[PDB]
Every structure is written in C-alpha cells, then in structure tokens.
Write a structure and sequence with these properties.
part of a larger assembly, 16 chains, A alpha/beta, F alpha/beta, K little secondary structure, F: alpha/beta, globular, K: little secondary structure, EC 3.4.21.92 (chains F, G, H, I, J), serine-type endopeptidase activity (chains F, G, H, I, J), serine protease (chains F, G, H, I, J)
Chain lengths: 196, 196, 196, 196, 196, 178, 178, 178, 178, 178, 6, 6, 6, 6, 6, 6
Amino acid sequence: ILPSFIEHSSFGVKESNPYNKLFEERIIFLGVQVDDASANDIMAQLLVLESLDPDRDITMYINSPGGGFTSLMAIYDTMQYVRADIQTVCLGQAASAAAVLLAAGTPGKRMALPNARVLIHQPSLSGVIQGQFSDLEIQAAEIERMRTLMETTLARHTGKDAGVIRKDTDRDKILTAEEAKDYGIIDTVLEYRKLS
Amino acid sequence: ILPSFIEHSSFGVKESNPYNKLFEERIIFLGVQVDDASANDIMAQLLVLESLDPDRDITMYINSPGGGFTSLMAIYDTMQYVRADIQTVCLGQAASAAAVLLAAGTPGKRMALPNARVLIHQPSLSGVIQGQFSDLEIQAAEIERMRTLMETTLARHTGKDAGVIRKDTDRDKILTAEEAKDYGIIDTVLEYRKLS
Amino acid sequence: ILPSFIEHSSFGVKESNPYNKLFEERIIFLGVQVDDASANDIMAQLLVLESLDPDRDITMYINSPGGGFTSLMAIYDTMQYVRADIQTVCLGQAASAAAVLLAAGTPGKRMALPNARVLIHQPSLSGVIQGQFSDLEIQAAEIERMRTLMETTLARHTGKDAGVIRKDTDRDKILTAEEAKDYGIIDTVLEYRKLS
Amino acid sequence: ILPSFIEHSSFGVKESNPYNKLFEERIIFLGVQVDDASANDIMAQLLVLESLDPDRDITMYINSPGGGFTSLMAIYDTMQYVRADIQTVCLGQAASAAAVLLAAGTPGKRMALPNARVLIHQPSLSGVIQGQFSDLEIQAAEIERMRTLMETTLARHTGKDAGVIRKDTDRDKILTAEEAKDYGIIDTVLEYRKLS
Amino acid sequence: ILPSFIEHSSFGVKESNPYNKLFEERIIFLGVQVDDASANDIMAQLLVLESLDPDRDITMYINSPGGGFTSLMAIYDTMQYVRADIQTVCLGQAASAAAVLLAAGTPGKRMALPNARVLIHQPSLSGVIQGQFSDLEIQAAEIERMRTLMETTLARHTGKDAGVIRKDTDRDKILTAEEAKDYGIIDTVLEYRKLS
Amino acid sequence: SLTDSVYERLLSERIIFLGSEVNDEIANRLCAQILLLAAEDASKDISLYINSPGGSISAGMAIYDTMVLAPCDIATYAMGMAASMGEFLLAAGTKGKRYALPHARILMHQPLGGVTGSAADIAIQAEQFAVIKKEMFRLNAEFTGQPIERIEADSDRDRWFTAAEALEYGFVDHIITR
Amino acid sequence: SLTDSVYERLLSERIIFLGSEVNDEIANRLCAQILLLAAEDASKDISLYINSPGGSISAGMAIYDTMVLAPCDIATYAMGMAASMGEFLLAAGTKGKRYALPHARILMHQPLGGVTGSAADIAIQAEQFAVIKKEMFRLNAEFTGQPIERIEADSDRDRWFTAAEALEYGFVDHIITR
Amino acid sequence: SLTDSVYERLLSERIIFLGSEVNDEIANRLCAQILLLAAEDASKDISLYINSPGGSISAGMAIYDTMVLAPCDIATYAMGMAASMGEFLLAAGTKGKRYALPHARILMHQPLGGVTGSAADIAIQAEQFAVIKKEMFRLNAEFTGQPIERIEADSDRDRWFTAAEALEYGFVDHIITR
Amino acid sequence: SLTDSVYERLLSERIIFLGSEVNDEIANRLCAQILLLAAEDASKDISLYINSPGGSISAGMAIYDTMVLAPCDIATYAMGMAASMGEFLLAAGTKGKRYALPHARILMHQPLGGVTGSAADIAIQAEQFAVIKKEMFRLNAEFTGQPIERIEADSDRDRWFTAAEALEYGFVDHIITR
Amino acid sequence: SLTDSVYERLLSERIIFLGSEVNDEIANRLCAQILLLAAEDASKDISLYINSPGGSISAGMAIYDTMVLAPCDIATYAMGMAASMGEFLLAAGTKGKRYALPHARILMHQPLGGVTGSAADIAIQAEQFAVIKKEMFRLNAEFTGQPIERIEADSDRDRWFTAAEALEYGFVDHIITR
Amino acid sequence: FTPXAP
Amino acid sequence: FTPXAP
Amino acid sequence: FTPXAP
Amino acid sequence: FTPXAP
Amino acid sequence: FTPXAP
Amino acid sequence: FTPXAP
C-alpha cells in the first residue's frame, strides 16, 4: 500500500502519490520493471520531461535487476538524445544492463549510495529469439553484436578499453559503490546527510 | 476490507484511509511487502516525507518477514541519507533483514512492543542469481559480501563485535522484545498506555 | 455484492457501505482475513480510532478461522496499547488465535452471541519458517515459545492457570458461547433483543 | 452486465444499480455467495438496516446453494438479535443451511415462490477443519454438535420434533414450495400477481 | 470494447453505455451469463423495472446457451410474478432452459428473429449436487422432478401435451424460428424492417 | 513386483483375493481367476478372501454368477471388511464354508450405484439399479435365511455386524479361531 | 527391482516386513504373505520385522487375525519404529518370540482413524472406531499383561517407550544384542 | 534395469551399497539386504559401500542395529561422501575393517531431524530426537575412541574431515591405496 | 529394454560406459560396475568409454577412487565428449591405455560445483569445492605430465582440445584410427 | 515390449537401426550396439538401417568414429529419411555397401547445433560447431567424391535428393529394387 | 415482491 | 426491435 | 449490537 | 504509538 | 537525494 | 524526438 498524501496552497488541495511527486521534481524512477514494456515507459518519461523544460536536468534513480539488452539500449539512446543533462543515482543495485544506463549519465553526475552494488554482466539471449533458422550461427552472431555494444558503450562512459570491459564482463564482476567510481561508472559516492 | 473514514473541519470534508492517515502523521508502515518492488515504495515515502518537512522525525513501523537483502540495503541507505531522524517501532516481528532496518533507526529511538519478535538471520541468496557462471565461486563470494555487510551494519547499530553478530546470525538467534534491547537493537520496550 | 446505501442530512448526501458505516460507529470487523497482511489493517484501524477519539470505546467484532500466531500477537499488543477500552463480540466463531483476541478485550466487556463457537488450539507453525538450520531444534524451540505465550496470555485474561490452558489447548477444546463464559473468555452472552 | 438506471426528482439525478435499489427498500439479497466471507456482509447489512430504522421490517431474499454451517449460524444469530422483524422469501432454492435461515424469519412472514425448492441437508464438515489431532473423535464430535444445532434450530421454527427433523435431514429430504409450508418452513406460497 | 456514447438535452450531458440504454427502454438482456449468479441479476432487474413503472411492458432479449435449471426457474417465477407484461425476443439462440423463459412471456408477445434457434433439452444435473447420499435414488428422483417441471411448464405455454414435450425433449429437438411458432413457443417471427 | 508374485503363488494354492473396489476392472480380474482355477482343476475348492468396502452392484453380480458357474465349491472368508457387494460375495459362498475372522466387520447394505449421463440416461440407470438391488436383496434373503422384509430393514441402513453377530444373522457359518 | 528381489528371497527364508503405512493395501499384502508362508509349510516359524508408524486400525486388525489364523508361530521384531498398529502387531507375536533391537522405539497409541464422508457417515465411522479401539486396548492388555486402565492411560497419550522400557512393560520379551 | 542387475550381481558377492538418502525406505532396503546376506551365509563378511549425505536419525539407527544383529563381520567403505548417518554407519563397521578411499569425505554431524505435525507433535519429535541424538554421540565416541565432549564439539558443527584426517580421528582404520 | 540389454551384454565383455551427467547416481552406478567387474575377474582389463559433459566434482572423484581401487587395468576411451570430470576420468586411465577417437573433444575444465542451502552452507560448499578442485588440478598435472600452473591456466578457461591436441598435451596416449 | 524384442532379434542378425533423433542418447545406444556386434564377431558385416531427420553434430560424429573403429564392414541403408547426420552416417558406410531404397530421401545439410548458456558459452559453442561442421563437410566430400565447394553449396541449403539423385551424387552406391 | 415483501 | 419490442 | 456494543 | 512515536 | 540530485 | 519527429 503506497500511501497518498495531501499538499496544499492558496490555489487548492492536491492529493498525490510518491512517484508522481518524484516526477514533478524531474526524477524518473527505474525499478524492478526491466521488461521491454517498461523501457517504453522510461522513454515516454524522458520525452515528457524534456518537453516540459529542456534546460533542466533529469534525475534517474536506478534500482533494478538488469533487464533485456535491446530495450535497455532503447533507453540508452533516448538518454543520449535528450537535450537536458541526465544524472543518475544507483540505489540498491544496477545489475548488468542497468549498469550501462548508470554509466550513461552525463559525466560528473553519475552517483551512488554507499552500499550500492553495480554488476557487470554479459547481455542475455532474450527478446526476439523466436526461432532464427540457424540459431547457432545467427543468435550466436547477434550475441557477439550485443556483447560488442555493451563493451563499447561502457568503454565510452568508463574510460576503460573495451577489451578490459570484456575481461571483467565475462567473469560477472561485481563492484561496490566505491569500486564503481574507481572503475569509471560512478563519479561520486553520496555522503549521508544526517542532521545528527 | 480496510474501511475508510471521514474527518471534517470548517474547510471541508475529507474521506481517508488508515495508512493514508498514518502517512499524514509521518508514519511509514513496512508490512508483508518485503520484495524489491516494495523497497522502492519505502524509499519513495522517505524522500517524500523529508521533502514535506526535513526537520520532523519519520516514524517507521516494522512488521515483516524479512525480505531480500539487496533491496533492504537500499532502504537502509535512504534511512541513513535522510536529514530527519527516523525512529522505528517493531510490531509483531522484524525478521532477518528487517531487524537491520529496526536497528538502523536513530539511537534512543529504536522501540518495540512487548511481544515483538526480532530474528537475526543470514542474508538469503536471491534477487540477481540468474546464472553467474561459476555460481559456487561467485554467488558464494557475493554471499560472503552480504554476510559481511549485515554483520558490519548490525555491529554499527548494536555495539556488538561483528564476530559476535556472526555467531548469533549463523544460528538463527531469536530475540524477545526485552532481549532485543539487551542485545542493542531496541532502546526501549513500550509500556501499554491503557487508561484502565 | 455488498450494497451501498445513502444517508442524508441538511448538509448533503452521503453514499456509504456497510463496514464503512461500522467504522464510523467505532467497530472494527475482524473477518476471514486472518493473514499477517490483515493484522496490519487491524492495527491501522485501532490506531486511527484512538486518534479520532481516545476516550471512546472501540468495539471489535470477531468472526474468524484463527490466523497466524505472530501477527495476531501484533494485534494483541496494539489492543492492549490503545488508551480506549476495547470490547469484543464473538459472532460465528473465534478460532484458536482469535480466541485470544476475544479474551483480550477489557474485562466486563467480552461478549458473544448464543451460538458462537470459541476454539482453543495450539499456535501453528507458520510465517517465518523459511528454513532455520536446525529446524527441529529451532522451530521446535520457537513453537514452545509460542505455546507459552498463548497459554500465558489466556491465563492473564481467563483466570485459569496456564497449565490448565495447556491441557485444554493440547486437546483442541471447543467451547460453546455459554461454556466460554464459565471458562473465562466471555463475560456475557447476548440476549436476542427482538421486539416481538 | 448488470445495467444501471437513473432515477430523478426535483432534488437531483441519481444513478443506481439493482441491489443498491433493493437495499434502499430494505431487502437483503442472499445469493450464491455462501462463504464465511459473505456471511459477514449479510451481518453488516442487517446491522445497517436496523440502524437506519429499527421499527421497519427487513426482507431477506434467499436463493442459494447452502453454505458453511458456522458462518450461516452467525447470520442466524444476527437475524434473531435485530429488533425489526425479518421476513424471508425463497426464490429458486434454499438449500441445506439456507433452509434454516429461511425458517428463521418471523412466523407469519416466511414466504416462497411456487417453484421454490427447499432442501434439508446435514451440516457439512468445513471451515476450521485444519487438522484437529483426533479428527475422528473431535471432528466427529463437532459434527454431532452441528447436527444437533441444525435439528434444534429447525425444530424451534418448524414445530417438528428434532427427532423428525433428523430423520428427514439424514435422507436429504427435498421439499417443494407447497410441501415446505406443510413442513413448517414456509407460512405462505406467493400467488402470481399478474395484471393479465 | 463496448463503446460509450453521449446523449444530450437542455438539462445536461449524459454519457451512457449500450445495455444501460437498453435498460432505460425497459429491455433486459439475457446473454451468455446463464449461471445461478446471473439469474439473480435478472430477478433484480425485473423487480426494478416493475417498481419504476408497473404498467409498462418489460422486454426480455434472449440469446443464451441455456443454463442451470434451478436458477432459471427462479427467473421464471419472477417473470410470472411481475404485474407488467413481459415480452420476449429470441436473438441467436434460446437453448434448453432459456427456451422455457422464451415460452414464458405473455401470449401474443413471444417473438423471434428469422434465424433464431430454439432448442429443447432435458434439464441438466447441476447446482446442488454436492453428494446426496443415495445419489442414484435422490439425484435420480430430483431429475425426474426437474424433467416434470420443464415438461409441465412448457405445456402450459405451448399448448402441447406434456407427454409430447417429453418425447421431443428426450431427443434434443431443435426448432427453427418458424418451427418454434408452429410448436407454440413463438407467436411471431419478426420481419426485417429495412428502409431499402 | 512382490505383490503380484505373492498373489500368483497363492493363486496356485487356489486362493483368490478381493481386497478392494469391486468395480468392473476387479470383477473382470476375479471372474478370470475363478474361471481359471475351475478350468485347471474343478475337483478342488477355491478360497476367496474378502477385505473390501464394496462397489458397483453389477460388478458384484458378475463375480457372483462366475462363482456359481464354476463347478467347484468356493469358500469365502471375511478377513477384514465385507461391505455391500463384499458382503454379498461373502454370503454367497458355499454353505458350510462361509467364514469370518473374529475382528471382521460385515455391512449388509446396498451399493448406491452412482449417477452419470443425461437426464434420459439417469432415469434408466436408476431403474436398472432398482431391479438389480431387488435381486441383491432376494439373494441375501436366501443366503442368510432371513425374511426379505428383514433384509430390506437392515440393508437400507448403515448397519454393521460384528463377526459374531454376522454368524448369528446367517452371513457366516463359522468364526475361525486358534 | 532389487527391492522386490530382496524381499522375495527373504520371503523364502520366511521373513516378512511391515516397513510402512499399515493401510488396506499393506494389510492385503501381508495377509497374502502370511497365508502363503503358512500354506507352504506350517511347521516352520515366520519372522515379521516391523519398522512402521502405523495406520488404519482396521488394517492392523486384518493383519492380526491373519497372524492368529496361520497355524504357525510368528516371531516379531521391532527393528526401528513400532507405532500404533505397528506396536500392536509387535505385541501380538507369539509370546517368548517378541523381540526388539536396542534402538527400537515403541509407541503404544491409538490410530486416529481419519474422518471422511457426510455427517451421517462420520457419525458411524466414529462409532466403529470406538468399538475397534476398545478391542485394540483389550488385546494390548492381554499382550502386555497390564490392567486395561493402564493401557488406556498410556494409549491415549503420545508416550514413547525405549526398547528397554518396552521390555519391562511387557511388549517385548527380549532385546537382541550381539 | 542395468542398475538393479548390477546390484543383484554385487549382492551375490556380498556387497551392499548405501548410495543415497538414508531414509526409512533406504533403511528398510538395507536392513532386508543385511538380513538376507546373513541368512544365506553368516560365516562370510559383508562389504558395505557408503556414498551418502545422510538422512533421518532413526533410519540410520535401524540400519545400525541390523548391522549389529547380523552374526557376521561388516566391512565399511567410504567411497565418496559419508555424512551424518553415512558417517555413523561407516564408523559402525567392524573395527579393523573400516576403510576410506583417499578422496572420501567424512562429516561427523547430526541429522537435523525435520519438523512435522501440530505443536503437540513437534514438541515430542524434538524430544525423541534429542534422545536419539545423544545415543548417536555416545556411539560415535565408542566407535572413534574420543571423549564424548569432543564428539559433541565436532558433531554440532559442519566439520568435514578429509580421508586422512578421518583416519587420525578414529572413524577409519585404513585408507586404501594402490 | 534394448538399451539395458545391450549394456549388460557389453558389461560381460568388460565394457563400461559413462555416457552422461557424472552425478551421484551415475557415480554409484559406475562404482558398482567397476567393483563388479573387478570382483568377477581381476586379471582382465576393463574398458571405459566416455561421452560425457561432466558433473559434480565429488562424483567424479568417487569414480576415480574406485578405478584406482580395482586391481585391474582400466583403459579409457574418448568416444565423443570428455569434459570436466569426463576429462579427468579419461586422463585417469592406465598410462599407455588412454585413447581417443579422431573426432573426440576434450575439455579440461573444472566443475562449477553448484550453490545450494543457507549462507552458512554455501560458505562451506565453496570451501570444500576449492579443496577438491585443487586435488583435481594436482591429479591432472600427474596424468598429463604438465606443470600445475599450466593446468590451472587451461582449466579455469573454456579451452577445448581436439583429439590430436589432447594427445600432444598428454591426456591421451593414442588416437585410434582404421 | 514387442518393439524391444524385435530389435534384439534383429541385433542378433547384426542389424542396427537409427530410427530417430541422433542425439547423445541415441549415439550412446548405437555406439554400444556397434561395439557389441564387433566384439561378438568382427568377421561379419553389420547392417545399419537409417530413417532419421538428424540431430546434434557431435552425436553423429561419435557414431561415425565408432563405425570406423569397429573392425568390420558396415553396410548402410536409407530406408526412409537420411537427413543431416542421418545422411552423413549413410554416406559414411563402407564403399560399395551404401544403399538406398527407391523412395528414400536424402538431405545433405548441416545440423544447426542449437544455442544454450551464457553469452560466454554461446560464443564457444558456435566456434566448436564451426569446426565440427567444417569436418562434416570435409568428410562428405570424401564420401561422395565431390569438390568441397560443391558440398558446401548443397549443404548450406535445404536441398533434398531423391534416391536416384543421391546415387548419381555419390551418397549411395546402389538402389535396391525387387 | 409486494405485497407483502415489500 | 420496434415495433413491437419496443 | 447495542446495547452494549454499541 | 504515542508518545513517543508519535 | 539533494543535493545534488536534486 | 524533434526535430524532426516532431
């Protein structure tokens, strides 16, 4: 049960939800919905926020168990397409494909919480895998294309040679929030801003 | 059927639910929804309450059968990140990971009801366990990382050496509401404030 | 199909449901929803009613096939915590754990309908039973703790020695509405207030 | 698709459903929902109608395939508890337990349609049958208690000796709308009030 | 997707659905919902229409794959009980029990479309068939009662001897829209009122 | 299969068991065993051991007619339960050779038949049942030496007989003790 | 099947196992094995090995009467668990030949029967159970040499006996050691 | 079945395997094989090969008592895993004939029993378990020649022994090499 | 079963197949076949044909120790795939008798073990695995005549050897052609 | 099983069928049958009847190497379909003894292998496949007497040969008529 | 249903 | 459907 | 249910 | 729950 | 989360 | 996506 809350001003009274409130603050929250179907929602949200105000940063919060490669590349291109800077925060985890989206934010603006976990994994075989005739020649070739894109895409955002990314990707390397900055995914790890 | 109720003033008439009412009073209720998906709701609620009034305490009620380790660490970091003090109350139970969130509240403000049960258990193997290649080298290593974080995190909130926490965690130690204060999880056990 | 109905006054017209109407009259209706998830709703309702008016009695109607022990203890503590008297009525049945909640109301205010059935049963093994290592040493120990709490809790509300409660509990003793008052669970059995 | 309809007056325009309209006319419609869960709705409806106007008769329409014994006794006690007379109409069928509720209405006010079928059957073994230890000593004893209550309850409403009710109950006796009045369940069988 | 439509007048603007519109025109549409649960909706609709205006005919459209015998007799009695004439139209099909409801309309007002199919079938064994002890003596006897009612009921509406109805019923006789009038179910077969 | 091996070894000792169901599959299995033993050597007795809740009335009659057909005495034993058709077949053994063990329980009752098919079929199954049931009662009267009225009074009720009572009633000629 | 092969080889050594359930299927299997061994050679003993939680009270009685019927001594061994009817059958072996292995555990208790059918049927099953149970207790008193009151006091409770205690109580004549 | 054929041929060589589970079904199968081999020729040794994670503590005790009962030496071999009751049975073989292969792994630990039934039943299962477990530890102390306190210190922990360590500890008399 | 019939006829020719899985069930089946053939006649060779992706590291070690234990040469053949433990067992045959067919493919690699249980159990399984794996590598170094460092460099990677390469590396002594 | 009985009787006539799948299970079954017949009498021919859509390329190679290994001629017959590895094995029989029945259909094509595992594994399976496939084509060129380029041109397409065309192409030496 | 209910 | 229904 | 609840 | 939460 | 996001 | 869509 996500509770609603009421906010008011001399204009009137507005009932709203968390998440709707975060969107008003230009925060896109990428959670467990990592399906191609949700990739479309993230793209719709990025396009809406750019339309509402092209010069204001969009903050994307990432807490997700990866997802399909093809549709998370769709998000990647929208993120790079949009005029406004996109800053990213890793909460919880950014597994596999989501680690690319984390790295994809504007440099200087990739962030993580201290116990955040970033996992680099090879792209899975999914989505349109309906029965290509020579699956071992075609799906195998498509997988090499997908591995190449993930390695290339991380190299462009982490500063590591794509060959290095491959060696780590092939071994399911898991980074801590601090290791992720030394690896080039995170620019900073957030301090806990407690008043006591 | 959770009933609704009507509250009114000279302004107008408001129909509301329990839970929505608790949120207005700055209470986050963490129940049976212990999935990564709900961890995201708790984080959204903590962020909303801080935004509405950064200097007022947030009360978190805990009654839950643990949950996934990764996503409950996401809650943990948000709880420590937020400027306002977070106080916690254990109702029913705070199993495993939820016992960390219980311990995580600001010292002097961890509370429990008299028959509350606090259980300390090792982090489970869950979430992103999709098929790491060497699962026995990698998942086994990730588990040691998760055990280390739980032990370290409780030690920072209970005052016990992490080695002690491990000895108890490994044996599924169950604490009563009173034992939990002597163990360092609870600062106080609530009296029953009956008028008769 | 629970029908709605309309009640009106010079203020305006209000459409409402049974159950919402009962809540306005400060009646909590505990039905077939005996899951940990519903225990949380009962607690939210008790807290709301105390908040709306701390000096007015809360009436709890009980008609339920028991439920989980841990979460019904969560209700028990809330019932004892709340400032207002809680009176209870057994309609239908109050099986096992629900018989504790029935006994738990303020003395002089435990009531039952004439054909009400009160069943005393041992607490079940449920909830957080995920796989404690030595289940036969740990779950077996946790069960003895739960049996002890139920026996102790009934003894404090029925006046019977806990040893007596155990002998009856172990044999699944079933009480009639009248036997329940002689047993200490019910203070009175309601007369039928028919006008003809 | 139950259609809605619109009724209007100089006050305003009201959209309503059948069933909601029947409730405004103080008719409780007991249909196929014969679960313990629905017994609670019938009780909530009886309590609401008494509250709205204690001196006006409540009409209960019965068309149902029996139901659980325990929860239909909960309805029985509410029906006898309520100050207002309850009159009953059997439409279709009143099987087993529902035949008790049919008989339970105020004498002189039990009615049936001409092709209505009333079935007298023994109470089933259901509800709280979770695993009483000696099920053959305990459930068997509980069943004798339930048989005794049904036989006693019908005897108090039909005028037949409980021993007679048992002989018929044990053989699944089925009564026609006319036989039911001669048997003591129905006071009258309704004429068809056609204008042509 | 049943579309909605908007109808307006100087009073205001009303959005409505087909079916809701048909109900305003006093048409009850009996479709594929042939369960005991829907029989209750038909009865609620007949009672509402009589209440709104007792002297206006109710039109019932029938297009259904029969249904349970017991609950369709409940409809039959309501149809005969209601003061207003009920006229019936067979669209598509009126299988088995629905053919009785078709025949049941006021004489001179039973209608069918030209390709309508009317099927006469024996009542099925359904509904309360929970486990009568001597099922072969009791259910077999109940079936003979149900066959007798269907045969008798059709004879009263078709003019055929019940013995004739049985001979046809036992052979699953299927009538065309025209044969149905010669058989006594339909008074007329509707012409197609096309303007070109 | 130890279970089937043991039964074949017993079949060679001319021992047949009715340990369950008394349905068409069981009746076909026993009819085949009775015909087989009679074919192998009709000069010797067949011992039928019964421990069965009963079953379809027509299955029990198929077994019964085969027992009668076989030109050899059939001894019957109630080694546990003999209910409904199990009782019929117990009572149906050769007079002087119907036995019960001391804790055997005998239920003279009727099969309830079971209802299947369309109303047209049910109406017939019920009639065929009533006819077969009447014969079951006629034969139980002959087997036990009781008035038909008494058989009906006990048969339409769930009346259990202890092994000792069953002997007094005439279902069993002897109780076997050691 | 190695499992069935081993049991057939043991059956030829006149060894029978009751390793599970004691339900109607098991009772029919043991009754058939006891009858078979007795038929093959009644001058020799049969050794029954018990490792069973128990089962239906009527199944245990069918096995018991067959054990009594067979004109040959039956030795019984508690090689593990002998609970409820497993205990009954252990205690029911020939006196002087009832054995337990040192870690055997014996539970004198009652079957709980189990509830099935309509209220009309349950009301009877409960009565038949009460009668059979009374006989189970009467026989346990004869087997162990205890007052019937003591048998009931221990039988309606979940009271486990160690093998040594079981001997003292009278269920077992000897504990077998090496 | 090649699998069953091979085991029968090995059973004739007096070789028994405990390759899985050590549950009641397995205990009944081994008890039957041990009794059979002892019955066929008690002058010859039986070789028990163990490759098992363990199982119910009471199943392991049934196997153990049968091993003791059989009047013939039983050699035991750890050919892979010998955990919990698998270890017990390994250690329980005749002294001087307990063997392990070099890569064998021995886990002296306790069965965890398992929890079933109502609170009333669980409370007893836990007590019966505590008693059997105490005997398991007493016997392991006798088998290995260790203080009971040491057995408990190692048995309540997941402490694996390599085959070489197991020999030093006293579970195994010899490591077999070639 | 033609499949089992053919394998029994081959077992009599002293031919054993490892055609799948190398799990505990397979290891128990092969250990039994190796022990059986050695028991029947230890003066003759056993030919083990391997076509297997591999399996649990501990299952492969149970097979290996049994191969060593049996006092008779074991020839090994790679007739298809010999991966992970399949490779180990191929390499483990008697030197001079390790063969591969020309299209055989050999993968020296490690089992990945597999993760089960609570964090407490996983932490141990991983340690036991690391120890067994170290022995697997030590033995592969002895079997192939390679530095242990080279074995690790190839074993932690998915490096396939063609049959010809496998001979050069030392897994195989001969490639069999006709 | 009539099906298995017929195949055993044919195996004794030295007739082997490849009637389906050509997967690892089938390859292990045929390799065992070829080794068995060769072991029983290597002086006699083996007749392999093929009616199969094909299967894993590595399974077909295991069968092929076993056919080569066996020191006896193997005749092959296309009695229906011989596709992919079925074609390979047909073509792979001894020259002068490769036969097709008139309505046989031969598809020289490649297995498509199949994709499983992580991207890391797929990348290897594809490479191993490319290597095995290249050998399949090399061998088909040797079997049919065609340029390797022609084999590839026909093998990467779904090109069916009628039995008569298959002979002209070189897959088959004779068409068998009567 | 009236009269008499309602 | 009118006339005549409605 | 009153009196006395409510 | 107050005091002190709230 | 601000600063700096927002 | 503009320009040019929109």
